[PDB]
Amino acid sequence: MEIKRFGRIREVIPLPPLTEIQVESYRRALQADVPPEKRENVGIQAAFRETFPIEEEGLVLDFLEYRLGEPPFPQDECREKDLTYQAPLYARLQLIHKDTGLIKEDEVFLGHIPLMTEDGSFIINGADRVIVSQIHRSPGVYFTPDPARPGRYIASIIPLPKRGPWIDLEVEPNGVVSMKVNKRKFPLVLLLRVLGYDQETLARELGAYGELVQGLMDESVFAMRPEEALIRLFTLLRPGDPPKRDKAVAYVYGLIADPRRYDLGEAGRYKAEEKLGIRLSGRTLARFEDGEFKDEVFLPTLRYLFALTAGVPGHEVDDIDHLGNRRIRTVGELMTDQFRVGLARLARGVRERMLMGSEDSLTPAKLVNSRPLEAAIREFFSRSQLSQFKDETNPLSSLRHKRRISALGPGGLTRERAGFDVRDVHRTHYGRICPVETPEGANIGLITSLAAYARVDELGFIRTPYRRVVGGVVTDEVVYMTATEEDRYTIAQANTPLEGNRIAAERVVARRKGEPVIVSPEEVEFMDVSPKQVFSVNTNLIPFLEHDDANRALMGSNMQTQAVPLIRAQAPVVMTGLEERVVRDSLAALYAEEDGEVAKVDGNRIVVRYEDGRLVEYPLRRFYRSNQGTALDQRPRVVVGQRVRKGDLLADGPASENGFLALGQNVLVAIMPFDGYNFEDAIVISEELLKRDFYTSIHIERYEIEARDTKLGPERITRDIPHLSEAALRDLDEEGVVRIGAEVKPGDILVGRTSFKGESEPTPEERLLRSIFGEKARDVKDTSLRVPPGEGGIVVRTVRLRRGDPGVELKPGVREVVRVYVAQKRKLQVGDKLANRHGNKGVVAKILPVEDMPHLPDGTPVDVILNPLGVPSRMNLGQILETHLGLAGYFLGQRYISPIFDGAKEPEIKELLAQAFEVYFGKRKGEGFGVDKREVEVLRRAEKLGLVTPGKTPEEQLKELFLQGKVVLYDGRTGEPIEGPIVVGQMFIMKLYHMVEDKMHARSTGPYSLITQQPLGGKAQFGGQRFGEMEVWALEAYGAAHTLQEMLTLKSDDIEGRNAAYEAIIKGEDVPEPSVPESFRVLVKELQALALDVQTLDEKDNPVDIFEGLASKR
Amino acid sequence: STSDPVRQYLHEIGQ
Amino acid sequence: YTGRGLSFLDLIQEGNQGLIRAVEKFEYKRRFKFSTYATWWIRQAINRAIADQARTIRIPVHMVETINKLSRTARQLQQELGREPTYEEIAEAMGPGWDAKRVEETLKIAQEPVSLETPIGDEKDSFYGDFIPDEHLPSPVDAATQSLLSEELEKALSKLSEREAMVLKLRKGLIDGREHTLEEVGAFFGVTRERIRQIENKALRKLKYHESRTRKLRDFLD
Amino acid sequence: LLMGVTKSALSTKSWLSAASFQNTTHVLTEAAIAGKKDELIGLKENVILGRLIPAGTGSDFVRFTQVVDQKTLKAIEEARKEA
Amino acid sequence: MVQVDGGRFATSDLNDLYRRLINRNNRLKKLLAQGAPEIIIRNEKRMLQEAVDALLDNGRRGAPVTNPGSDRPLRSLTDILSGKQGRFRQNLLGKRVDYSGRSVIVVGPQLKLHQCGLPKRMALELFKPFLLKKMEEKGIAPNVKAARRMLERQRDIKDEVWDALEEVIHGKVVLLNRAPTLHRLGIQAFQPVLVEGQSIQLHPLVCEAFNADFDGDQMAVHVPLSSFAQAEARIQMLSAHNLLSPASGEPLAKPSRDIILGL
Amino acid sequence: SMARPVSIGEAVGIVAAQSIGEPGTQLTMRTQGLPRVIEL
Amino acid sequence: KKEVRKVRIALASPEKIRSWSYGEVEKPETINYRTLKPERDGLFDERIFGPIKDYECACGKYKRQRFEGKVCERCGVEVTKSIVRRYRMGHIELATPAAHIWFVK
Amino acid sequence: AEPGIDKLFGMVDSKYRLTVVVAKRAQQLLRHGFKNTVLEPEERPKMQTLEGLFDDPNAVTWAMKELLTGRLVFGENLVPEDRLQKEMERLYPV
DNA sequence: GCATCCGTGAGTCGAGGGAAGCACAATTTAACACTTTTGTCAAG
DNA sequence: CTTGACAAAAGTGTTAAATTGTGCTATACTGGGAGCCGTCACGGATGC
Ligand SMILES: [Mg+2]
Ligand SMILES: [Mg+2]
Ligand SMILES: [Zn+2]
Predict the structure, then answer these.
(1) Quick one: which of A456, A913, E237, G72 could link to E189 by a disulfide (CB 3.0–4.6 Å)?
(2) Where is it found, in Gene Ontology cellular component terms (chain A)?
């Protein structure tokens, strides 16, 4: 099956490593490989150098270096034993006694740092996790227009999140500039005076703009001493505290000049210098040296504000949503921020413990308590909003999860407090954030994806590649440039025609600050690398994307992440070209390190003899269960004695076919209505798909039970469960756990456990019953684990963890934990959800036998029938073009690569269809078959529809239809042709993770809530359906007083009514009249707890007791 | 500080 | 002492009570300054208040001292082994009379209860209390089967004699709710203790014979 | 006087329906001080107490209808008029 | 203060708020008996006032009281009765109910306007008490307790159970519900047709009223129990009886996309 | 809903609220659309 | 008996609040950390809010409905249904009056 | 649609009164084991079972069919509530 | 008029998510016999 | 139907051992510490 490739755009650089946003950031933070003396001041190394040294103010604790050890357990063990994959962290600290002048050095164990796997995820408590990158406002100095008063601007100084307060500079109507800090406003002259600024010094700089300086030249404080001004400023900031120079200086110094409390950041400092045209010595607003405060950024900030207000040509306002003003905090920066938080708490303990207790006889080990640091790290990786349960339904699911950019989380927007501005597609998103990929709903625009070619630079700004164009000739020099730098050039389009390397078009479509323009070749300065850089990885996997409406292409890319791996998965017939790279960069497959020969091939491992002679064995992940239950296994793709070159595929991972991403099947599709089973997005499929195991997936479920020590006695996992016949215990082994390979259905025992019964005298009726039968009650009860309703499969694995096992960190009181893995092979069924890459999704509503499906004249039935009514409203015409190319490839036995926005066109598709007709119809002529009578009837109607040319021969008119993608389709039930030619083709359809098997749920009675006594919620809890307010309104509007009353009392929380209703039904009687619900009784008692006398009265105003006399004091 | 019980107490003991 | 279960103002008020005690017991004859002696009582009151008010389920003072010492011992072993010590390391560190079983029991005792209103998930619409069933009140199935059993037993005892049925309904506590001893039952009917044991044994035997002929009561026995 | 839907609903005469809509603290504090009595006129008040709503089959207009056949009706009338 | 299955203890935030008030009340009594200075007594009285505030309405005045080791405010009596998660809107105006199911919906073109396709296994659980009586009426089970055991294990269910279930649901109706319930036509009563599978079959003509297509939608199933509930559902709420729109009076069950195209 | 005189006992208040608010999602949002109805 | 036709809400006086209560809560103790039983005079006291299990006193001397409506002398726990524990209220006697925040803020 | 629903709606002034009449009649049929039915033996509802045609167990179906016949009398203040039950018990002991 | 404080923002589902010690007096609990009370056995 | 002896179970001290509650420590020490902006936007109600 040869692959035909379309397109003329030649990409000069390949896609960057797709996970480098995760992998690179964490390596920079840890710096675990650079020798300690070569480590740079970034990551956790910068965190150590900031908090340390710690000074008592006569003891100084110093930091020399840190190191990371080998992880205690491998990744596989951590998952199996519910551990965290981490490396011990040791800091080499030296304690110095200033008085005596002695240094004592020792290496202190600071804790464990979670390690990042090779793919870019973490194993926190045995579960894979992904730290989602966060996008926020870049630190720096920004000048925005005042909305209330036109002609007035506000200057804002924004530090790193939780690294200082925001500073706002405003020009009051009175003419006095005010500085607002911590919601407190005051005149900047007082603060500006504290920085040693006199009357003439300001006039030398800010006096050349107009009357604005007049409001900043108050002599009421200019003559005032800076020390007095500092005390005055301290009183304004926090009033009430006893004013003192030692207290006032400490508050002011730490407010704007303390590097351990105020941090403008590397990005903030870089932005400030680029905007104000200055050079910051550090990353603080002011510097405290020589016992006096030195200004760093306040003066240039005020110079810019006045000049901007005056109207100087070179000063402009700032667009806060501009992608050059927004930066990305990757996993490394997010982790380091929490590391600094915990390391600051560790410094606090050292300071407070080095001044109390054997001051002379102190060592760094005694002073350092690492508990605060570990808690900060473990909290981030577990209870953080950006630390998310990894999505690994298929290899593409986890690749997308790592490239997602979230505006939410600690220090970000709120899902409800975010407006339209933050959710819009900014012009600077071009080439940095995908414009289509986003969650539709409440999170639309708040969670996005990194573009394919984009990479986050060191400061956190997304850069995208552009080709250098000089003299009208496009060079191969690629320049990565941020949004702010990209605004200075005219950037052409990747589709601009070129005669070699020179731009051939006389008029070139370009962008100037996001505005499309028509320019000549001599006016062009940069060119796009390729159309792929505008979209994410998911959206680059949609062929014919230029023909799909963006609202539907959003669904098409999001659904690819939910497709389940299939045992017979196939790569699409029409691909875009990223299929091989997605599989390669997901690390789910296995490739040869270098040239060699395969020595042993097996279902469990592969052994390769490399040319250097070393033997490498590669175990294969077999029937492993992902976070979402899908089975992830690698299948060997080589044979013993096969020579493999470097990078050659050795084993396919989940959802890959010979190294190509295979998220579904290639099926024969007919686009036509069918007896109402296509109605409103429903899908009709053939029984032939099931027969050959198409859309069959393997899913694994994990069941866990525990044996605990109890006051009444210990829970025992045993095969001798009381009052159980031999049928129920047939599949359990002698240890009480179900044997491997056993088929288990709902109600079957997985692990047999017995618990001691709490001593309670039996009811008299039960005591009489036992006496009649002469049976002594047992002291233990059945508390074993059974298969829940709607579940089952084949037992494939049992894991038994016991107290005292190496690495088994069980909870106190837990004797052992037994885990059972049940695997089921799921075939396609009615209610399962199918989708294609172009946003077309639906549920299987009918599975027809093969003899009922429409078939081609050669006898080939179609596989799926799709309703044409889904296209016109959705405007997703890519699926039609894919179907046409699939039909041509079905008869030519080949596959195609059509890159998005540069690929197959209808003139090129129709030449392929002309070839496919010769094999499709030329075969028939040789076999001795002409044109059917039934085909002639359809041709007569087609010429009346204007589909074929009158006067042509039947064969000529059949070819005219074929070039339109239409064939004469016969009806499998009647045998007569469909009255019109039908669009039949081959389409790539994915089976999504949403299956009716995991969603059907019913309940009669079950668990009830503690306080309100209403049914619990959720299928896992066997809970009831929520009859919310809106559902109650519908019954009220219907006039169903008695139906409504039942749901409120008898079926929800009327404890007496629900007990009597159930007993009435099983006796063949009608349910009784309901009574007061238990939720109203709770409300009355809760109102009484507020000191409110709520009383229910009767027609005569006399009190009525709704508590049955149980709460009345005699 | 009226809204801050601790500052209010510290002020009282400072008298 | 902040961050140990009590707020700053609660610590101050407990400290003030220690300061009141120091004033009463202080002796100026010794010529020691007041803060020297009052600091003992202020710390003593603050520390005791934590041991008595910092936990929802109060743990005695001696058990709090054991728990604090156990936590201190584990942290020192943790910093020296480069890993969390096992219960054997901690037990050996604590001293004589300590084993791994006791260490595990102490850690289980020192577990704070978890709030029923703790949110789960990003959305603030789900809590712990929404997943905890009420297992005190009988369910509709349990209540119905209890009434079915009583209804069938009432018919079964109907086949018995007028007195024999009454004897069983008393000896098994089916009337007053509580069992009546042979002598206690005998006073009701004025018959000897030994006689009642005979009729009750005979009446009970007859009920067995009927059940074998119908098997209408064996299901309720599990 | 003209007022909006929110203000018109919050100033209703039933504290049960008003307390379950908005401003529960304000609605209940005013209801408690006045000693307000809820007559259970609307639909929300009855739904809260688990009663039969005064609409549809729960309306007094239709709620007391009686159905009886001819044979029993004659027996009742014959058994009463004879005396 | 309940003990979870694992042995751990779970408690409500009211116990913490009550303990603070009792701890501060008791301390004030001790200080008053000790003749403490007015500064100490005033601080305790001010704290006791704030402890009552936090219990009655946490966060209304000043900083909210939080549980030590966390930043989550404690839930007070006012928070219990107020808000979208309060007693009124969460437990009184709406409830979770028994005899209710849920599943994915697929299109049933063969159904009548008043019929729905209810899966057999959903119907078994929804109508369980009725089924146990019918099993006991026949020879399937000796009594209701024996019959209930049979249904507990899937492999223990005989083929006569399904015949009895077909008798239990005869004439009865169920309520199909799709959220959001914008108007009253978002709940409708249908006569179930027991079907093999796990998805509910919905008539094409009621999809516009439900606003339900078949790209993954799910619906809830509710069983009215008494004779009034069945009479009301079969008379007023039946799908075949609600053919016009209550808002405009125009047909609401009428030919739709594929039907219009064929005609 | 029945093209006949309303029957005594119908909850016309709930029907009125449901009829008005149901097409609310079809009103424009961008003094026009849903915001115009809310201020009215 | 009679049907509920109205619901009235009013302020509760200190006298009425004391008539509701079955006893004063004097200790912040909830349950014993070892036996896990309610503590005397605490927030979960059985002598105030009722027995934890039906017709069974804390001292374990009465364990049947025969002694319905009785109060044990050894422990003081009434022998009744444990559902009363959802309806029976206690009270705290404040050392000084405290304003209701609803009628202030 | 229920059979004869158009005729049933036309027998009452309010549609909710028909639900009350049918729901109350169905309970009378259930309480007396369908022995008080005003339907002739050839008019009784039947259900198709595997063994054969048996009487319909759904009492709401019986009530609706009886109402269409016109042999039932409904209204308000027909007979005392207490006296009606006593008389029905005598005629159709259960 | 402006300035300030408060309450409001759709539904259903879903997995996932659960830092001192010691000395001593008092009080509660567990062991150990030893004493009536209860169920039985064989008789008459 | 009723005794007479019979061993076990339930009940009543009595006492030593765990368990828990309370008091005390004497160099001098004397006013916290966290935070901090995409601060959410609008309309109502009150205090001026
Ligand atoms: Mg979503
Ligand atoms: Mg849909
Ligand atoms: Zn007692």
Answers:
(1) E237
(2) DNA-directed RNA polymerase complex
Chain A interface disruption, residue of G54, G86, G91, G100, most A CBs within 10 A: G86
- Find the domain containing D68 and state its range: 64-83
Residues sharing a CB contact under 8 Å with residue A222, sequence separation 6 or more, in sequence order = A189, A193, A198, A199
Q: How far is the CA of C200 from the centre of ligand 2 (A)?
A: 70
Report the distance separating Cα A695 and Cα A685, nearest Å: 11
CB A523 within 8 A of CB A496: no
- Nearest in space to A653 (alpha carbons), one of A635, A629, A631, A626: A635
Pairing label, strands A86-97, A59-68: antiparallel
CA–CA dist A264, A282 (Å, integer): 9
* Domain A16-138+319-464+530-588 is found in CATH 3.90.1100.10: yes
Domain ranges of chain H: 1-94
Q: At E30, phi and psi to the nearest 5? A: -65, -45
Structure tokens at A798: 């049992």
Strands of A3-5's sheet in order across: A3-5, A895-897, A574-575
Q: How far is CA E73 from CA A175, A937, E88, E239, in A?
A: 44, 77, 21, 48
For residues D51 and D59, give the distance between their C-alpha atoms in angstroms, rounded to a whole number. Answer: 12
Contact E243, E208 (CB under 8 A): no
Backbone angles phi, psi at A1109, to 5 degrees: 75, 10
Q: Inter-chain contact E238–H2, Cβ cutoff 8 Å?
A: yes
Tokens 């890519």 -> residue:
A878
Quoted resolution (Å): 2.7
- Distance in angstroms: CA D14, C1' J21: 55
Q: How many CB atoms lie within 10 A of CB E39?
A: 13
- Angle of helix A1055-1066 relative to helix C140-158, nearest 10 degrees, comes to 50
Query: Do E142 and E100 reside in the same domain of the chain?
Result: no
Distance from C-alpha of A489 to C-alpha of A527, rounded to nearest angstrom: 10
Reading the block at residue A390, the tokens are 């990894």
Is there an interface between B and F (3+ Cβ pairs < 8 A)? no
What Å distances lie between residue A869 and A681, A705, E201, E255, H53, CA to CA? 9, 50, 21, 15, 46
For the record, the structure tokens of A529 come out as 């690398």
* Residue A935 · residue A948 · CB < 8 Å: no
Q: Is the CB of A156 under 7 A from strand J?
A: yes
Name the fold adopted by A139-318.
Answer: 3.90.1110
Same-domain pairing of E111 and E179: yes
Q: How far apart are the first and last CA of chain C?
A: 58
DSSP assignment of A348-417 equals HHHHHHTTSS-SSS--HHHH---HHHHHHHHHHHHH-SSEEE---SSHHHHHHHHTEEES-STTS--TTT
CA–CA separation, A218 and A174 (whole Å): 12
What determination technique applies here?
cryo-EM
All CATH 2.40.270.10 domain ranges of chain A, comma separated, are: 1-6+663-695+828-992
Compute the half-sphere exposure of residue A904: CA atoms within 13 Å on the CB side of its CA.
Answer: 29
A347 alpha-carbon distance from chain centroid: 35
Chains near C (3 or more Cβ pairs under 8 Å): A, B, E, G
- The CATH fold of domain A1-6+663-695+828-992: 2.40.270
CATH 2.40.50.100 domain residues, chain A = 589-653
A114's enclosing H/E stretch is strand A102-114
Contact (CB, 8 A) for D54 and A1045: no
Q: CA of F9, closest CA in chain A: separation in Å?
A: 8
Q: How would CATH label the architecture of H1-94?
A: Alpha-Beta Complex (3.90)
Question: In H, which residues are within 8 Å of A1042 by CB distance?
Answer: 23
Say yes or no: E128 and E201 in one domain: no
**Beta-sheet pairing, A490-492 with G6-11:** unpaired
